Amino acid sequence: MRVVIQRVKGAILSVRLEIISEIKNGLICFLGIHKNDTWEDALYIIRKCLNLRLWNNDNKTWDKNVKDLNYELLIVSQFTLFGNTKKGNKPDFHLAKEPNEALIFYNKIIDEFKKQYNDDKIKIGKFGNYMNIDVTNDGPVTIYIDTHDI
Amino acid sequence: MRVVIQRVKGAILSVRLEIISEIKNGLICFLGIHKNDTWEDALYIIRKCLNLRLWNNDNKTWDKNVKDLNYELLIVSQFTLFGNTKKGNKPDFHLAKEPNEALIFYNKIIDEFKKQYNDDKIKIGKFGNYMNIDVTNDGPVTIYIDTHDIN
Ligand SMILES: N[C@H](CCC(=O)O)C(=O)O
Numbered sequence: 001m002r003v004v005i006q007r008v009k010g011a012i013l014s015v016r017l018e019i020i021s022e023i024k025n026g027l028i029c030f031l032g033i034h035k036n037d038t039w040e041d042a043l044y045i046i047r048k049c050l051n052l053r054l055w056n057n058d059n060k061t062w063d064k065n066v067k068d069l070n071y072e073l074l075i076v077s078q079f080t081l082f083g084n085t086k087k088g089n090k091p092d093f094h095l096a097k098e099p100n101e102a103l104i105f106y107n108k109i110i111d112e113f114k115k116q117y118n119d120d121k122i123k124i125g126k127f128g129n130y131m132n133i134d135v136t137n138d139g140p141v142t143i144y145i146d147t148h149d150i
Numbered sequence: 151m152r153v154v155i156q157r158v159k160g161a162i163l164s165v166r167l168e169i170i171s172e173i174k175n176g177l178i179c180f181l182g183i184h185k186n187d188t189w190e191d192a193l194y195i196i197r198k199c200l201n202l203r204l205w206n207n208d209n210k211t212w213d214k215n216v217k218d219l220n221y222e223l224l225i226v227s228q229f230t231l232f233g234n235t236k237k238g239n240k241p242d243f244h245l246a247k248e249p250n251e252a253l254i255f256y257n258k259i260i261d262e263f264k265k266q267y268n269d270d271k272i273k274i275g276k277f278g279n280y281m282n283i284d285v286t287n288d289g290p291v292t293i294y295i296d297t298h299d300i301n
Contacts, residue, residue, distance in 0.1 A: 002294070004154055004292055004294070009282070030290070030292050048235060048239075051239050052235055052239055052241065053239050053240050053241065054241070062240050062241055063240075065239065076290065078290065078292050080289075080290075080291050080292050080293060081292055081293070081294060083293045083294075085198055085202065085293065085295055086299075086300065089198075089201045089202055089203045089215060090203050090212050090213070091202065091203075091204075091212060091293070130289065131287070131289065131290055132159070132286065132287065132288060132289075132290075133286075133287035133290055134284065134285070134286050134287070135283075135284070135285040135286075135287055136282065136283070136284055136285075137281075137282065137283040137284075137285055138282065139230075139280060139281065140180070140226070140228065140281065140282075140283055141230050142154055142180045142182075142228045142230055142231055143230055143231070143233050143235065143241065144152065144154070144231055144233075144294060145235060146294075149236065150236070
């Protein structure tokens with residue numbers, strides 16, 4: 001499983017154009033889901049997202065995590081992360097989980113996100129649909145995790 | 151070398167704030183240089199950045215690249231990509247290249263980008279400075295490349 005975590009002042013997610021999602025300060029989380037992810041993969045992700053320490057605090061660095069600062073999370077599904085760029089300039093996304101069944105997985109993950117923090121503080125995007133998101137990158141801080149490194 | 155590439159309608163790169171960079175359509179690339187990166191490691195990035203066909207063009211999808219549609223690239227150095235998070239919740243940047251050499255390897259990379267696309271098309275941040283980037287994520291579309299899985 002694959003996540004890009006970008007630290008943000010805020011985020012505003014939009015479909016076709018309308019704002020349906022918003023966080024002010026927090027993390028944006030681009031979530032790619034391999035065809036062979038097991039629930040465990042989804043735990044590791046959920047965990048680190050909440051748990052990683054991407055904020056300095058009062059003369060200390062990399063110290064407080066989302067939860068601590070009472071900050072939100074914008075979870076967007078992103079298969080393009082299994083974009084394969086070793087064939088050629090066109091990317092084949094084979095290695096990503098099939099949308100109809102990936103959608104189940106996402107939702108599970110989104111529920112468990114809430115149970116692992118505070119439902120009031122987890123936002124999402126429309127799975128199927130094309131999205132336009134305005135991001136304020138704070139720093140910025142980009143962090144990559146491929147759960148298949150365990 | 152690591153890189154995140156997101157397709158975007160535009161971007162604004164401000165510093166501590168007063169602005170320094172805009173792009174309309176195109177790509178933004180957070181690029182992490184690994185302590186050991188050869189010049190090859192660069193090229194693969196640069197090559198794959200310009201040439202990746204990420205825009206639907208006509209009734210075709212995943213077809214046209216950034217140089218084709220005549221779009222910009224904003225290149226933001228981002229060590230936190232070698233934030234080792236595997237063990238611990240405090241990220242571990244030991245695989246990252248020192249900011250003094252990093253600066254020129256980044257420079258050299260920016261040259262080559264220009265040198266290969268166009269001087270006006272390549273935009274940047276202020277290396278290793280707190281930056282703020284308004285990014286209009288179109289799609290969205292995100293691509294990882296670790297140049298170390300390449301043979
Ligand atoms: N690669 C993007 C995907 C956006 C979508 O999910 O529709 C596109 O073709 O527009």
